[model samples]
Target: GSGQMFGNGKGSYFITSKDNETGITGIRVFVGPVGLIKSIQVRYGSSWSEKYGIPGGKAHELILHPGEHIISIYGRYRTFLQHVTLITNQGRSASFGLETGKGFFAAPNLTGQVLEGVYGQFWLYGITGIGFTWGFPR
Candidate 1:
């Protein structure tokens, strides 16, 4: 629950698809207020396979050509759905987000499905690494 420190509070998590190898077809993200989700808005960036990097700005729909590419992630929230497009070679000038009404609670397993799709095989984030890093041997 959102009442809890890090819980979603009936929110949901998901990923937008990207090219798995060079460009990500679907990158993972979170939404909702309590292990439930409706939708999300994501800010994205376009960089070179080795030339550019995510500049971190307004979100754009991730579009990439073949042959090793990388896209970064971020998010914003609103109840409306909008789409934008940007162009770049080695500059972080691209990204977008999604709007949701209800998906998490309605589809309990949707979150997990998104994880597997975007993160691949077995995926975890945020809390996934907390225990290992926070209380590490001092």
Candidate 2:
């Protein structure tokens, strides 16, 4: 369940999902600007075999307005996330990554300037607690 999204400053972005955790069902991309993201594309590794939009949301190749755009993977532990891409109307984007530290499954779990809060815990089911917030430390 180690996955991260990166931007190219041109309204295009990529998300890489490495072997870390499990049960990755969906990916939510928050656009900073409304009506900017034009389309989204997904492929597996280097095969270019699949192409479509996020499930459980709007159409695939329509207006991707600013806000939360959820892409459904349906609990698929596939490798398609390794080639997830996004295209915008103009050229605007951002980048986010996963950082390692301690006291978590991956240690420090996730670290970044834009990350305000990150917490992880486990109980009888292996991984029972996981939370991620957006922002900087107060």
The candidate that achieves the highest TM-score relative to the unseen native structure: 1
Global lDDT of each candidate: 0.24, 0.25
lDDT of 2: 0.25
Q: Model 1, 15-60: lDDT tens per residue?
A: 3332232233222223223221222222223422210111223322
Give each model a TM-score.
Answer: 0.25, 0.18
Q: Which candidate number has the best lDDT?
A: 2
